[PDB]
Nucleic acid binder design. Structure first.
Ligand SMILES: [Mg+2]
Ligand SMILES: [Mg+2]
Ligand SMILES: [Mg+2]
Ligand SMILES: [Mg+2]
Ligand SMILES: [Mg+2]
Ligand SMILES: [Mg+2]
Ligand SMILES: [Mg+2]
Ligand SMILES: [Mg+2]
Ligand SMILES: [Mg+2]
Ligand SMILES: [Mg+2]
Ligand SMILES: [Mg+2]
Ligand SMILES: [Mg+2]
Ligand SMILES: [Mg+2]
Ligand SMILES: [Mg+2]
Ligand SMILES: [Mg+2]
Ligand SMILES: [Mg+2]
Ligand SMILES: [Mg+2]
Ligand SMILES: [Mg+2]
Ligand SMILES: [Mg+2]
Ligand SMILES: [Mg+2]
Ligand SMILES: [Mg+2]
Ligand SMILES: [Mg+2]
Ligand SMILES: [Mg+2]
Ligand SMILES: [Mg+2]
Ligand SMILES: [Mg+2]
Ligand SMILES: [Mg+2]
Ligand SMILES: [Mg+2]
Ligand SMILES: [Mg+2]
Ligand SMILES: [Mg+2]
Ligand SMILES: [Mg+2]
Ligand SMILES: [Mg+2]
Ligand SMILES: [Mg+2]
Ligand SMILES: [Mg+2]
Ligand SMILES: [Zn+2]
Lengths: 66, 100, 51, 108
RNA sequence: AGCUGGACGUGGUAUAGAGCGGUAACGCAAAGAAACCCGGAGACGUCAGCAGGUGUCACUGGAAGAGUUAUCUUUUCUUUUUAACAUACUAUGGCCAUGAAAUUGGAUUAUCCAGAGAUAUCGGCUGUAUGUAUGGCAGAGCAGCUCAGAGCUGUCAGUUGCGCACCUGAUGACCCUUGAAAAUCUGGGGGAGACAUAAUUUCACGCCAGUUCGUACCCAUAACCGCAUCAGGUCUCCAAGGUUAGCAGCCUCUGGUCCAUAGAACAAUGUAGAUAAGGGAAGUCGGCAAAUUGGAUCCGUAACUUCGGGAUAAGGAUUGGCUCUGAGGAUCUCAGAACUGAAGCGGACAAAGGUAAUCCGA
RNA sequence: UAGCAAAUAUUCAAAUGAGAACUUUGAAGACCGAAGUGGAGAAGGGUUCCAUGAGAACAGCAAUUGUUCAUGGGUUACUCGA
């Protein structure tokens, strides 16, 4: 499992059978890409990055929420 | 220093005339200990009664743990314990209940 | 113990099968004297040779 | 107090058989098999025995897994020698040839 | 999640010969190659102490549950967890600069190091995690509370230990002892060959595979060997609290167990266990057996001797409880005084009886 | 008849059964006391493991119980070992 700090690489990865898993925690939110040998997590604190990334969900990738 | 408060929900027993808010109140005032004192309720600590509930407010650090303790002792004195149990209703409140 | 040869496994299996009782319907044949299987064996009282 | 169980069918305590106690998300204390430590890489020259810098100390296998960096250094003998030995080598070679030529001209 | 072997795909390194940075240690996803020759790891004794980490144990505030409640107890117990693996940082040592040290310094508990360059610099590089943070991860696990399979709440924040078991790190001591090898992974020196529409390259991400055999269960006061369900014998790992020098004994928690044919009487004789007034080996081949002694602290300690020893020699005292006082340290030991008991107090447990000669064998 | 006496220990109620000091649940009292009567292995054993059922025999008293009898069922690996 790898995690990503900078949204850019994350977006290069979800731009590269693709599905995206978003999960809510009290203080934080996480976005999760499945790829052959790695599970990519992306965490953010503030709601701005949050909504912005929710926007970022493309038609190619389907969004699952737990 | 902090503002703390805790709510003991005495609702059920009052209705059947088992608990008397009045006496539970006195009891609590008696058994509450500051720095080893049974009586110095010194102003930092405050107790209120309602028909269904009791409220404890304090500037001085306190834990509802203590409230549960005292309550239990009360219940054992009133021999109610095979009937009533105290439980945690909310973070800040402890409710009384009958089982069966 | 745990560790075994094939040979072993197979031999043990063999003796395990051979250790069944005479099938209750064989005693009803016309030409047989056999009431029971005389060759049955109990692990505790008699030991096999496997090394 | 939690007690453990070997997981390997080797109950004897051998340098290769070592175990470490790990605490799981389950709340269990589980034996996990710990690997063996290896000796750091030393310069290969005679009597030298210096610990090489900038090379990874890794169990022999993992050496196929690492990046070129850890396998090496940038000197003339990067992997095999330390600087001191390199230096002394250079110097010695140069000066020795000098004496060689000198003997040559003194012969001719 | 990782590994090895395949085989191409897409990106990217490098070159008209073959990365770039730093004075230097060295650095950075990648940066051409055969024979050939050399390496590193694998690859190693015993013991002694030091340092760190893991697990465990202890303690602190918060929350949920449970035990106690005539009296006392802001109480007593319980849960409060984090896998391999990914990235970044720190980690007992070693190096590189700069500069050289005598009124020699530095440094460890111990050694030990220095002009063959010590100490020291807002210096720098590097090596090892059973470390930290995040990912994994909470969605799992755990603890509570509801509803009639669905649901809700909390799983938080600290401190210390010559404590203990293991591991690691840096050392030290020892030998008329000096403590495997190979497979395997990898590095260096060398530059013969190969190649323009080309050639070759320890970068990423993607595609494919991993066969055969062993995996039950006992490992013992009932699954083994002792003709047996035999008081014998049979190689290992994990280990909690209290007392304590202690992994001893004694008592406990986790987990396990009450299985050893039973009932009643209570004579002799017996097997095992204890105690005997006065004397004290008179018993007996013989002090056989029993008894005495026993810890720790303080006193005191001969002849003899191979000067190491003898040596707990011999011997003499003290030991509880309670209330105070002083001293040793970081950003748990030691000593004093007073009071109080049927003068008891290593209260169980644990735990030498001495001395003087003779003979052997060092 | 000798004898069934080592390894501290059992007791109460219910249930099941023709039958219970010896089986199962619960309630008490004790033991091993993490150098274990605990949790797992190697050697050795080879199905003794699991479930259901049970007449005799065996489990040196007993048994409704079993390491016993009968019937069925259990041992999955690129990373553990060979
Ligand atoms: Mg995978
Ligand atoms: Mg309840
Ligand atoms: Mg075998
Ligand atoms: Mg036998
Ligand atoms: Mg035999
Ligand atoms: Mg591959
Ligand atoms: Mg050594
Ligand atoms: Mg607490
Ligand atoms: Mg350093
Ligand atoms: Mg949850
Ligand atoms: Mg230590
Ligand atoms: Mg050991
Ligand atoms: Mg040596
Ligand atoms: Mg080369
Ligand atoms: Mg035996
Ligand atoms: Mg009797
Ligand atoms: Mg006498
Ligand atoms: Mg006398
Ligand atoms: Mg006398
Ligand atoms: Mg004697
Ligand atoms: Mg002396
Ligand atoms: Mg003395
Ligand atoms: Mg003497
Ligand atoms: Mg005294
Ligand atoms: Mg004193
Ligand atoms: Mg006195
Ligand atoms: Mg005494
Ligand atoms: Mg004597
Ligand atoms: Mg002798
Ligand atoms: Mg007898
Ligand atoms: Mg037993
Ligand atoms: Mg056992
Ligand atoms: Mg077992
Ligand atoms: Zn060297």
């Amino acid at each position: 499992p790898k995690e990503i700090t900078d949204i850019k690489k994350f977006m290069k990865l979800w731009q590269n059978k693709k599905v995206v898993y978003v999960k809510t925690n009290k203080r934080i939110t996480k976005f999760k890409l499945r790829g052959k040998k790695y599970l990519y997590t992306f965490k953010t604190a503030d709601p701005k990055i949050a909504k912005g990334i929710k926007d970022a969900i493309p038609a190619t990738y389907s969004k699952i929420e737990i | 220093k902090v503002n703390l408060g805790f709510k003991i929900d005495c609702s059920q027993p009052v209705e059947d005339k088992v608990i008397l808010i009045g006496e539970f109140a006195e009891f609590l005032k008696s058994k509450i200990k500051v720095g080893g004192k049974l009586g110095n309720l010194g102003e930092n600590i405050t107790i209120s009664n309602d028909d269904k509930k009791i409220n404890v407010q304090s500037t001085i650090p306190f834990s509802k743990r203590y409230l549960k303790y005292l309550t239990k002792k009360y219940l054992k004195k009133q021999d109610l314990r095979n009937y009533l149990y105290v439980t945690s209703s909310d973070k800040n409140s402890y409710q009384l209940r009958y089982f069966n | 113990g745990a560790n075994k040869t094939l040979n072993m496994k197979k031999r043990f299996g063999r003796k395990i099968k051979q250790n069944r009782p005479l099938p209750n319907w064989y005693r009803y044949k016309s030409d047989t004297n056999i009431r029971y299987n005389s060759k049955r064996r109990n692990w505790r009282r008699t030991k096999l040779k496997i090394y | 107090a939690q007690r453990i169980t070997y997981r390997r069918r080797c109950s004897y305590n051998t340098r290769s058989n070592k175990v470490r106690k790990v605490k799981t998300p389950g709340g269990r204390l589980v034996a996990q098999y710990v690997k063996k430590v290896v000796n750091y890489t030393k310069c290969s020259e005679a009597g030298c025995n210096v610990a090489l810098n900038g090379i990874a100390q890794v169990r022999p296998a993992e050496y196929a897994t690492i990046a070129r960096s850890a396998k090496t250094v940038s000197r003339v003998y990067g992997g095999e020698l330390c600087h001191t030995c390199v230096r002394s080598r250079i110097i010695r070679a140069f000066l020795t040839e000098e004496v060689k030529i000198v003997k040559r001209k003194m012969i001719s």
